[PDB]
Amino acid sequence: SQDYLSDHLWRALNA
């Protein structure tokens, strides 16, 4: 889930 976390987080901050 770390990959996911890194994923959705990046986008959640950018968008």
Concatenated DSSP letters of 1-15: -HHHHHHHHHHHHH-
Q: Give the integer Cα–Cα distance in Å for 6 and 10.
A: 6
Q: Which residues contact 10 (CB under 8 A, 6 or more apart)?
A: none
Q: Give the integer Cα–Cα distance in Å for 7 and 10.
A: 5
Buried/exposed code over 1-15 (b: 16+ C-beta within 10 A; e: otherwise): eeeeeeeeeeeeeee
The residue length of the chain stands at 15
Tokens of 6: 């890194």
Q: How far is CA 2 from the centre of its chain?
A: 9
Tokens of 15: 């968008």
- Identify the experimental approach: NMR
Tokens of 11: 């986008």
Tokens of 12: 């959640």
